[PDB]
Amino acid sequence: TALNEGRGDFFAVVKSLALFVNALHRSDQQFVALNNDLAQFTNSFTNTDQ
Amino acid sequence: VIKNLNTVLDTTVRHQKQFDETLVNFETLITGLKNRADPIATSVADISD
Amino acid sequence: QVNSGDAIQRWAANLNTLAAQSAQNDEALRSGLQQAAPTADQLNAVFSDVR
Amino acid sequence: NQLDTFTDELNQQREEITRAIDSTNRLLNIVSQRNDTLDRVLTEFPPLIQHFAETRDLFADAVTALGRLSAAADETLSGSNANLHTNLQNLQRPLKQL
Amino acid sequence: STQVNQLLVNAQTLLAAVNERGRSVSLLLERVSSVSRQVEGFVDENPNLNHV
Amino acid sequence: PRMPQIRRDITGLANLGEVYADASPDLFDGLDNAVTTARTLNEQRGNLDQA
């Protein structure tokens, strides 16, 4: 009963996450490249303590 | 898990309009910078040199 | 996201370090912006004089 | 039959499920105890990002102009870094005598 | 979601282009601090420059 | 038919949760100090534009 009272909300979550994932799934290597580039960029300004 | 996710989610909902605006603004900023990334990087390198 | 976990940990630590350094020099940042507003105008005036 | 299949498959992943539960518990505990910082970020960053998106073209022009200055400045300074030093070191004696 | 995807991919492209010149980018802060110190020292140690 | 994918998703979710739990404290300290410097940048937007 608790799940059924939130059934509309849960399936709205499902239908929204479906679009989110279907739009963000093809770029997995792009995301790995982005994280590596971000680490490289933020390492450029932290080679010393100050 | 339920308690802390409730806390985080209500905090996000409280600023929901700003949270929706910032994604679009960030996308526009990043696209505008990417359209000229090569001059940007060249100029930063020249500044350092 | 999991494959880049070491990268995201590294840039998180680097962002923490950079943010801490910037926050500990807040007043210096404010004075830098305040004095940086007209000094470029002065330099432009000098150069345009000798252009 | 299909319910038997599905329930067996889930039981084969119950350890992964509990590990994910513990991991999500720890991560959400950390975020909940930093909720104040989360609220501060959500209050203060969207206006800044909106402003930056408004002035992205101006920032690009500023960086490109500084780069245009600094490229020529660097080429001129590197093309005469040591010739200037040698010229000064030579001319120091005639300056003293004059 | 489409905005998020384009944001992430363009951020990757921009960061890659920026850190291609990593040797200069990493030394940017050190060089700017060094030139600041050098200009300050040059002005400080020649107080008679205006008279000349 | 899509149960290996479900196993992959659960395993990846656990790994990503552990990665984020490890990397969160540095990110949140950096976000605190970035909030401080973001407040500073917000209070002087006209100075930055003039600069």
mmCIF file of C-alpha atoms in Angstrom:
data_model
loop_
_atom_site.group_PDB
_atom_site.id
_atom_site.type_symbol
_atom_site.label_atom_id
_atom_site.label_comp_id
_atom_site.label_asym_id
_atom_site.label_seq_id
_atom_site.Cartn_x
_atom_site.Cartn_y
_atom_site.Cartn_z
ATOM 1 C CA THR A 1 0.000 0.000 0.000
ATOM 2 C CA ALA A 2 2.844 2.406 0.803
ATOM 3 C CA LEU A 3 4.441 1.690 -2.578
ATOM 4 C CA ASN A 4 1.093 2.021 -4.380
ATOM 5 C CA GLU A 5 0.475 5.444 -2.836
ATOM 6 C CA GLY A 6 3.841 6.512 -4.265
ATOM 7 C CA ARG A 7 3.396 4.571 -7.502
ATOM 8 C CA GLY A 8 2.908 7.675 -9.644
ATOM 9 C CA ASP A 9 5.979 9.345 -8.155
ATOM 10 C CA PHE A 10 8.078 6.190 -8.570
ATOM 11 C CA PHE A 11 7.135 5.747 -12.214
ATOM 12 C CA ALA A 12 7.732 9.443 -12.872
ATOM 13 C CA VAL A 13 11.227 8.862 -11.453
ATOM 14 C CA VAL A 14 11.580 5.850 -13.754
ATOM 15 C CA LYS A 15 10.441 7.752 -16.856
ATOM 16 C CA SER A 16 12.777 10.662 -16.058
ATOM 17 C CA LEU A 17 15.840 8.547 -15.258
ATOM 18 C CA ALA A 18 15.148 6.691 -18.510
ATOM 19 C CA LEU A 19 15.646 9.878 -20.530
ATOM 20 C CA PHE A 20 18.633 10.897 -18.391
ATOM 21 C CA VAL A 21 20.412 7.577 -18.918
ATOM 22 C CA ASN A 22 19.433 7.269 -22.596
ATOM 23 C CA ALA A 23 21.014 10.666 -23.209
ATOM 24 C CA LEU A 24 24.136 10.151 -21.055
ATOM 25 C CA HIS A 25 25.025 6.531 -21.871
ATOM 26 C CA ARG A 26 26.863 6.829 -25.205
ATOM 27 C CA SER A 27 29.605 9.120 -23.831
ATOM 28 C CA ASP A 28 31.154 6.778 -21.233
ATOM 29 C CA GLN A 29 34.642 7.165 -22.680
ATOM 30 C CA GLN A 30 34.025 10.902 -22.938
ATOM 31 C CA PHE A 31 33.310 10.909 -19.195
ATOM 32 C CA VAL A 32 36.516 8.997 -18.444
ATOM 33 C CA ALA A 33 38.429 11.464 -20.627
ATOM 34 C CA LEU A 34 36.721 14.354 -18.819
ATOM 35 C CA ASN A 35 37.667 13.064 -15.373
ATOM 36 C CA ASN A 36 41.279 12.456 -16.422
ATOM 37 C CA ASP A 37 41.500 15.918 -18.021
ATOM 38 C CA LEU A 38 40.011 17.475 -14.882
ATOM 39 C CA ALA A 39 42.566 15.732 -12.665
ATOM 40 C CA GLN A 40 45.369 16.832 -15.007
ATOM 41 C CA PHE A 41 44.110 20.435 -15.024
ATOM 42 C CA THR A 42 43.706 20.696 -11.254
ATOM 43 C CA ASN A 43 47.137 19.107 -10.777
ATOM 44 C CA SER A 44 48.672 22.008 -12.737
ATOM 45 C CA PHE A 45 47.892 24.461 -9.907
ATOM 46 C CA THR A 46 48.725 22.214 -6.928
ATOM 47 C CA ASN A 47 52.334 21.130 -7.483
ATOM 48 C CA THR A 48 53.371 22.884 -4.247
ATOM 49 C CA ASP A 49 51.593 23.728 -1.000
ATOM 50 C CA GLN A 50 51.098 27.486 -1.572
ATOM 51 C CA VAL B 1 19.680 5.494 3.668
ATOM 52 C CA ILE B 2 16.052 6.632 3.551
ATOM 53 C CA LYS B 3 16.621 9.312 6.205
ATOM 54 C CA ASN B 4 19.765 10.830 4.688
ATOM 55 C CA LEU B 5 18.435 10.638 1.130
ATOM 56 C CA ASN B 6 15.299 12.410 2.383
ATOM 57 C CA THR B 7 17.473 15.155 3.869
ATOM 58 C CA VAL B 8 19.568 15.603 0.714
ATOM 59 C CA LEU B 9 16.526 15.469 -1.565
ATOM 60 C CA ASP B 10 14.523 18.052 0.384
ATOM 61 C CA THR B 11 17.581 20.319 0.437
ATOM 62 C CA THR B 12 17.811 19.966 -3.352
ATOM 63 C CA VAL B 13 14.062 20.566 -3.798
ATOM 64 C CA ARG B 14 14.226 23.723 -1.664
ATOM 65 C CA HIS B 15 16.557 25.220 -4.305
ATOM 66 C CA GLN B 16 14.937 23.385 -7.227
ATOM 67 C CA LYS B 17 14.523 26.410 -9.509
ATOM 68 C CA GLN B 18 18.159 27.436 -9.042
ATOM 69 C CA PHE B 19 19.255 23.811 -9.480
ATOM 70 C CA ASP B 20 17.427 23.689 -12.820
ATOM 71 C CA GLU B 21 18.756 27.075 -13.961
ATOM 72 C CA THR B 22 22.388 26.296 -13.110
ATOM 73 C CA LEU B 23 22.559 23.214 -15.356
ATOM 74 C CA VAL B 24 21.448 25.198 -18.416
ATOM 75 C CA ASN B 25 23.676 28.154 -17.512
ATOM 76 C CA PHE B 26 26.686 25.871 -17.026
ATOM 77 C CA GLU B 27 25.976 24.129 -20.335
ATOM 78 C CA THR B 28 25.793 27.468 -22.157
ATOM 79 C CA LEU B 29 29.004 28.708 -20.513
ATOM 80 C CA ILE B 30 30.896 25.496 -21.285
ATOM 81 C CA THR B 31 29.672 25.413 -24.895
ATOM 82 C CA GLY B 32 30.669 29.048 -25.398
ATOM 83 C CA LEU B 33 34.117 28.325 -23.984
ATOM 84 C CA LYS B 34 34.503 25.138 -26.047
ATOM 85 C CA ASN B 35 33.687 27.011 -29.263
ATOM 86 C CA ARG B 36 36.899 29.022 -28.659
ATOM 87 C CA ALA B 37 38.910 26.551 -26.535
ATOM 88 C CA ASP B 38 41.882 26.610 -28.920
ATOM 89 C CA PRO B 39 42.404 30.418 -28.721
ATOM 90 C CA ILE B 40 41.775 30.213 -24.955
ATOM 91 C CA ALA B 41 44.477 27.579 -24.436
ATOM 92 C CA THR B 42 46.867 29.332 -26.827
ATOM 93 C CA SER B 43 46.372 32.611 -24.960
ATOM 94 C CA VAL B 44 46.898 31.032 -21.528
ATOM 95 C CA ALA B 45 50.113 29.417 -22.772
ATOM 96 C CA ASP B 46 51.298 32.734 -24.229
ATOM 97 C CA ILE B 47 50.507 34.503 -20.940
ATOM 98 C CA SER B 48 52.597 31.969 -19.027
ATOM 99 C CA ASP B 49 55.460 32.238 -21.531
ATOM 100 C CA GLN C 1 32.602 6.765 -13.328
ATOM 101 C CA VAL C 2 34.159 3.824 -11.455
ATOM 102 C CA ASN C 3 37.001 3.528 -13.988
ATOM 103 C CA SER C 4 38.028 7.133 -13.211
ATOM 104 C CA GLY C 5 37.712 6.923 -9.421
ATOM 105 C CA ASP C 6 41.396 7.650 -8.850
ATOM 106 C CA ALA C 7 41.080 10.673 -11.142
ATOM 107 C CA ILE C 8 38.026 12.065 -9.388
ATOM 108 C CA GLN C 9 39.653 11.555 -5.980
ATOM 109 C CA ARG C 10 42.721 13.415 -7.256
ATOM 110 C CA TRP C 11 40.799 16.379 -8.632
ATOM 111 C CA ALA C 12 38.645 16.476 -5.486
ATOM 112 C CA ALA C 13 41.772 16.774 -3.334
ATOM 113 C CA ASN C 14 43.235 19.374 -5.708
ATOM 114 C CA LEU C 15 40.007 21.400 -5.676
ATOM 115 C CA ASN C 16 40.014 21.252 -1.873
ATOM 116 C CA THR C 17 43.594 22.554 -1.777
ATOM 117 C CA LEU C 18 42.941 25.349 -4.292
ATOM 118 C CA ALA C 19 39.721 26.400 -2.558
ATOM 119 C CA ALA C 20 41.399 26.474 0.860
ATOM 120 C CA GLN C 21 44.245 28.605 -0.498
ATOM 121 C CA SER C 22 41.793 31.012 -2.150
ATOM 122 C CA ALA C 23 39.633 31.247 0.988
ATOM 123 C CA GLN C 24 42.600 31.969 3.258
ATOM 124 C CA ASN C 25 43.432 34.911 0.949
ATOM 125 C CA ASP C 26 39.946 36.382 0.553
ATOM 126 C CA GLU C 27 40.958 39.944 1.458
ATOM 127 C CA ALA C 28 43.989 39.739 -0.834
ATOM 128 C CA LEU C 29 41.657 38.613 -3.633
ATOM 129 C CA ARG C 30 39.311 41.551 -2.990
ATOM 130 C CA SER C 31 42.161 44.069 -2.974
ATOM 131 C CA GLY C 32 43.594 42.443 -6.097
ATOM 132 C CA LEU C 33 40.346 42.920 -8.003
ATOM 133 C CA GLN C 34 39.961 46.475 -6.682
ATOM 134 C CA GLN C 35 43.468 47.495 -7.754
ATOM 135 C CA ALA C 36 43.214 45.492 -10.998
ATOM 136 C CA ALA C 37 40.206 47.474 -12.199
ATOM 137 C CA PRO C 38 42.117 50.767 -12.929
ATOM 138 C CA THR C 39 45.719 49.591 -13.444
ATOM 139 C CA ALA C 40 44.884 48.091 -16.842
ATOM 140 C CA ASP C 41 43.296 51.430 -17.758
ATOM 141 C CA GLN C 42 46.503 53.198 -16.702
ATOM 142 C CA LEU C 43 48.602 50.795 -18.782
ATOM 143 C CA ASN C 44 46.307 51.242 -21.785
ATOM 144 C CA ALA C 45 46.561 55.031 -21.455
ATOM 145 C CA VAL C 46 50.367 54.901 -21.268
ATOM 146 C CA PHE C 47 50.629 52.556 -24.256
ATOM 147 C CA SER C 48 48.114 54.501 -26.367
ATOM 148 C CA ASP C 49 50.212 57.591 -25.665
ATOM 149 C CA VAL C 50 53.335 55.879 -27.052
ATOM 150 C CA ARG C 51 51.486 53.805 -29.676
ATOM 151 C CA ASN D 1 8.478 -20.594 -13.879
ATOM 152 C CA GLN D 2 9.677 -17.067 -14.671
ATOM 153 C CA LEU D 3 9.263 -16.029 -11.029
ATOM 154 C CA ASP D 4 11.500 -18.943 -10.053
ATOM 155 C CA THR D 5 14.087 -17.733 -12.568
ATOM 156 C CA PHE D 6 13.899 -14.114 -11.361
ATOM 157 C CA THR D 7 14.075 -14.983 -7.662
ATOM 158 C CA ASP D 8 17.065 -17.280 -8.221
ATOM 159 C CA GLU D 9 18.846 -14.533 -10.157
ATOM 160 C CA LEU D 10 18.246 -11.990 -7.371
ATOM 161 C CA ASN D 11 19.381 -14.450 -4.715
ATOM 162 C CA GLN D 12 22.563 -14.891 -6.735
ATOM 163 C CA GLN D 13 23.167 -11.122 -6.372
ATOM 164 C CA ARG D 14 22.082 -10.622 -2.763
ATOM 165 C CA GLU D 15 25.688 -10.050 -1.616
ATOM 166 C CA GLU D 16 26.194 -7.335 -4.229
ATOM 167 C CA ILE D 17 22.869 -5.834 -3.134
ATOM 168 C CA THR D 18 23.890 -5.657 0.532
ATOM 169 C CA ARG D 19 27.330 -4.274 -0.367
ATOM 170 C CA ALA D 20 25.634 -1.553 -2.422
ATOM 171 C CA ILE D 21 23.297 -0.864 0.510
ATOM 172 C CA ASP D 22 26.223 -0.399 2.910
ATOM 173 C CA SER D 23 28.124 1.749 0.402
ATOM 174 C CA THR D 24 25.130 4.001 -0.288
ATOM 175 C CA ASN D 25 24.534 4.248 3.466
ATOM 176 C CA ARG D 26 28.078 5.512 4.045
ATOM 177 C CA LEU D 27 27.989 7.971 1.129
ATOM 178 C CA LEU D 28 24.582 9.359 2.109
ATOM 179 C CA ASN D 29 25.697 9.674 5.735
ATOM 180 C CA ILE D 30 28.661 11.791 4.609
ATOM 181 C CA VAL D 31 26.496 13.959 2.363
ATOM 182 C CA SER D 32 23.864 14.354 5.087
ATOM 183 C CA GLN D 33 26.499 15.499 7.575
ATOM 184 C CA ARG D 34 27.694 18.003 4.940
ATOM 185 C CA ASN D 35 24.147 19.126 4.012
ATOM 186 C CA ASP D 36 25.027 22.611 5.301
ATOM 187 C CA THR D 37 27.754 22.936 2.668
ATOM 188 C CA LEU D 38 25.308 21.540 0.119
ATOM 189 C CA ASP D 39 22.806 24.277 1.015
ATOM 190 C CA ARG D 40 25.498 26.967 0.830
ATOM 191 C CA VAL D 41 26.561 25.740 -2.625
ATOM 192 C CA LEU D 42 22.973 25.702 -3.885
ATOM 193 C CA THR D 43 22.412 29.232 -2.552
ATOM 194 C CA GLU D 44 25.574 30.882 -3.831
ATOM 195 C CA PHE D 45 26.783 29.115 -6.994
ATOM 196 C CA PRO D 46 23.797 29.323 -9.448
ATOM 197 C CA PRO D 47 23.911 33.164 -9.522
ATOM 198 C CA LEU D 48 27.661 33.068 -10.170
ATOM 199 C CA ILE D 49 27.280 30.509 -12.962
ATOM 200 C CA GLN D 50 24.446 32.517 -14.530
ATOM 201 C CA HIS D 51 26.611 35.649 -14.430
ATOM 202 C CA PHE D 52 29.539 33.787 -16.004
ATOM 203 C CA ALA D 53 27.291 32.418 -18.754
ATOM 204 C CA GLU D 54 26.154 35.992 -19.408
ATOM 205 C CA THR D 55 29.755 37.246 -19.731
ATOM 206 C CA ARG D 56 31.394 34.200 -21.348
ATOM 207 C CA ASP D 57 32.065 36.095 -24.588
ATOM 208 C CA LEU D 58 33.653 38.982 -22.676
ATOM 209 C CA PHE D 59 35.890 36.580 -20.735
ATOM 210 C CA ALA D 60 36.911 34.892 -23.988
ATOM 211 C CA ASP D 61 37.739 38.275 -25.530
ATOM 212 C CA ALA D 62 39.759 39.255 -22.447
ATOM 213 C CA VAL D 63 41.775 36.033 -22.507
ATOM 214 C CA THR D 64 42.386 36.270 -26.268
ATOM 215 C CA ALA D 65 43.494 39.907 -25.970
ATOM 216 C CA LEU D 66 45.874 39.124 -23.106
ATOM 217 C CA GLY D 67 47.213 36.250 -25.201
ATOM 218 C CA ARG D 68 47.692 38.500 -28.230
ATOM 219 C CA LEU D 69 49.695 40.899 -26.069
ATOM 220 C CA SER D 70 51.681 38.165 -24.327
ATOM 221 C CA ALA D 71 52.634 36.268 -27.500
ATOM 222 C CA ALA D 72 54.364 39.292 -29.024
ATOM 223 C CA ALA D 73 55.762 40.284 -25.624
ATOM 224 C CA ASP D 74 57.241 36.811 -25.098
ATOM 225 C CA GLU D 75 58.715 36.644 -28.598
ATOM 226 C CA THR D 76 60.347 40.068 -28.175
ATOM 227 C CA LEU D 77 61.656 39.324 -24.672
ATOM 228 C CA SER D 78 63.065 35.936 -25.684
ATOM 229 C CA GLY D 79 64.570 37.337 -28.877
ATOM 230 C CA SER D 80 66.563 39.885 -26.846
ATOM 231 C CA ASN D 81 67.089 38.366 -23.394
ATOM 232 C CA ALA D 82 70.833 37.721 -23.737
ATOM 233 C CA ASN D 83 71.732 40.341 -26.351
ATOM 234 C CA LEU D 84 70.434 42.966 -23.918
ATOM 235 C CA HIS D 85 72.485 41.498 -21.064
ATOM 236 C CA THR D 86 75.661 41.445 -23.161
ATOM 237 C CA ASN D 87 75.021 44.990 -24.418
ATOM 238 C CA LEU D 88 74.533 46.275 -20.862
ATOM 239 C CA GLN D 89 77.612 44.452 -19.558
ATOM 240 C CA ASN D 90 79.681 45.933 -22.381
ATOM 241 C CA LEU D 91 78.283 49.460 -22.022
ATOM 242 C CA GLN D 92 78.755 49.605 -18.234
ATOM 243 C CA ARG D 93 82.427 50.602 -18.556
ATOM 244 C CA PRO D 94 81.888 53.422 -21.124
ATOM 245 C CA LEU D 95 79.051 54.700 -18.933
ATOM 246 C CA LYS D 96 81.384 54.896 -15.929
ATOM 247 C CA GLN D 97 84.081 56.645 -17.967
ATOM 248 C CA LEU D 98 81.570 59.099 -19.457
ATOM 249 C CA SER E 1 19.553 15.644 -19.743
ATOM 250 C CA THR E 2 20.646 16.672 -23.247
ATOM 251 C CA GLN E 3 22.108 19.849 -21.755
ATOM 252 C CA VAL E 4 23.943 17.752 -19.144
ATOM 253 C CA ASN E 5 25.411 15.484 -21.834
ATOM 254 C CA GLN E 6 26.537 18.391 -24.012
ATOM 255 C CA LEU E 7 27.933 20.143 -20.927
ATOM 256 C CA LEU E 8 30.036 17.117 -19.989
ATOM 257 C CA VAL E 9 31.367 16.442 -23.494
ATOM 258 C CA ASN E 10 32.218 20.103 -24.140
ATOM 259 C CA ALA E 11 33.886 20.326 -20.723
ATOM 260 C CA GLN E 12 36.013 17.326 -21.694
ATOM 261 C CA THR E 13 36.958 18.961 -25.003
ATOM 262 C CA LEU E 14 37.768 22.309 -23.365
ATOM 263 C CA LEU E 15 39.847 20.744 -20.590
ATOM 264 C CA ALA E 16 41.760 18.615 -23.107
ATOM 265 C CA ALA E 17 42.533 21.667 -25.242
ATOM 266 C CA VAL E 18 43.593 23.675 -22.181
ATOM 267 C CA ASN E 19 45.901 21.068 -20.644
ATOM 268 C CA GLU E 20 47.473 20.162 -23.985
ATOM 269 C CA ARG E 21 49.911 22.965 -23.059
ATOM 270 C CA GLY E 22 50.380 21.468 -19.614
ATOM 271 C CA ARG E 23 54.038 22.456 -19.290
ATOM 272 C CA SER E 24 53.205 26.167 -19.462
ATOM 273 C CA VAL E 25 49.880 25.875 -17.619
ATOM 274 C CA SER E 26 51.493 24.160 -14.621
ATOM 275 C CA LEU E 27 54.120 26.921 -14.397
ATOM 276 C CA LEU E 28 51.657 29.807 -14.901
ATOM 277 C CA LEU E 29 51.237 30.542 -11.178
ATOM 278 C CA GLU E 30 54.945 30.231 -10.360
ATOM 279 C CA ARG E 31 55.891 32.484 -13.277
ATOM 280 C CA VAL E 32 53.312 35.134 -12.367
ATOM 281 C CA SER E 33 54.494 35.157 -8.740
ATOM 282 C CA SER E 34 58.122 35.358 -9.889
ATOM 283 C CA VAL E 35 57.494 38.258 -12.272
ATOM 284 C CA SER E 36 55.508 40.025 -9.535
ATOM 285 C CA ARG E 37 58.441 39.684 -7.134
ATOM 286 C CA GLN E 38 60.906 40.820 -9.811
ATOM 287 C CA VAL E 39 58.895 43.928 -10.729
ATOM 288 C CA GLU E 40 58.455 44.804 -7.047
ATOM 289 C CA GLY E 41 62.190 44.417 -6.440
ATOM 290 C CA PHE E 42 63.100 46.427 -9.541
ATOM 291 C CA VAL E 43 60.872 49.328 -8.496
ATOM 292 C CA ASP E 44 61.926 49.140 -4.832
ATOM 293 C CA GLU E 45 65.688 49.127 -5.438
ATOM 294 C CA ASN E 46 65.729 52.100 -7.876
ATOM 295 C CA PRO E 47 64.049 54.971 -5.997
ATOM 296 C CA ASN E 48 66.127 57.517 -7.952
ATOM 297 C CA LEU E 49 64.723 56.377 -11.311
ATOM 298 C CA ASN E 50 62.258 59.284 -11.428
ATOM 299 C CA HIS E 51 65.033 61.856 -10.970
ATOM 300 C CA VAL E 52 67.023 60.270 -13.809
ATOM 301 C CA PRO F 1 16.940 -11.731 -20.334
ATOM 302 C CA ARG F 2 18.535 -8.534 -18.941
ATOM 303 C CA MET F 3 19.699 -9.973 -15.609
ATOM 304 C CA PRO F 4 23.486 -9.897 -16.284
ATOM 305 C CA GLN F 5 22.984 -6.189 -16.934
ATOM 306 C CA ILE F 6 21.219 -5.884 -13.565
ATOM 307 C CA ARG F 7 24.157 -7.616 -11.859
ATOM 308 C CA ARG F 8 26.548 -5.257 -13.657
ATOM 309 C CA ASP F 9 24.488 -2.246 -12.571
ATOM 310 C CA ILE F 10 24.391 -3.322 -8.918
ATOM 311 C CA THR F 11 28.140 -4.034 -8.859
ATOM 312 C CA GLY F 12 28.942 -0.716 -10.518
ATOM 313 C CA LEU F 13 26.597 1.105 -8.147
ATOM 314 C CA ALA F 14 28.368 -0.384 -5.128
ATOM 315 C CA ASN F 15 31.794 0.502 -6.538
ATOM 316 C CA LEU F 16 30.714 4.056 -7.399
ATOM 317 C CA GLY F 17 29.188 4.531 -3.963
ATOM 318 C CA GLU F 18 32.454 3.478 -2.334
ATOM 319 C CA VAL F 19 34.426 5.791 -4.645
ATOM 320 C CA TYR F 20 32.168 8.753 -3.861
ATOM 321 C CA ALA F 21 32.239 7.997 -0.132
ATOM 322 C CA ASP F 22 36.039 8.074 -0.277
ATOM 323 C CA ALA F 23 36.170 11.265 -2.368
ATOM 324 C CA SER F 24 33.361 13.223 -0.665
ATOM 325 C CA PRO F 25 35.142 14.939 2.303
ATOM 326 C CA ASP F 26 37.719 16.684 0.110
ATOM 327 C CA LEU F 27 35.009 17.745 -2.338
ATOM 328 C CA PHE F 28 32.836 19.158 0.443
ATOM 329 C CA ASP F 29 35.674 21.094 2.094
ATOM 330 C CA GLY F 30 36.547 22.462 -1.333
ATOM 331 C CA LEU F 31 32.888 23.358 -1.813
ATOM 332 C CA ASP F 32 32.844 25.245 1.504
ATOM 333 C CA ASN F 33 35.863 27.341 0.584
ATOM 334 C CA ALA F 34 34.595 27.695 -2.995
ATOM 335 C CA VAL F 35 31.355 29.038 -1.513
ATOM 336 C CA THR F 36 33.379 31.621 0.404
ATOM 337 C CA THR F 37 35.271 32.730 -2.710
ATOM 338 C CA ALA F 38 32.032 32.589 -4.742
ATOM 339 C CA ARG F 39 30.423 34.988 -2.278
ATOM 340 C CA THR F 40 33.471 37.221 -2.711
ATOM 341 C CA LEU F 41 33.178 37.045 -6.511
ATOM 342 C CA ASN F 42 29.439 37.778 -6.334
ATOM 343 C CA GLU F 43 29.915 40.850 -4.136
ATOM 344 C CA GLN F 44 32.291 42.406 -6.719
ATOM 345 C CA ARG F 45 30.776 41.465 -10.084
ATOM 346 C CA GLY F 46 31.097 45.018 -11.408
ATOM 347 C CA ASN F 47 34.785 45.053 -10.498
ATOM 348 C CA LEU F 48 35.314 41.817 -12.434
ATOM 349 C CA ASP F 49 33.454 43.117 -15.499
ATOM 350 C CA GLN F 50 35.427 46.375 -15.483
ATOM 351 C CA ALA F 51 38.643 44.377 -15.088
#
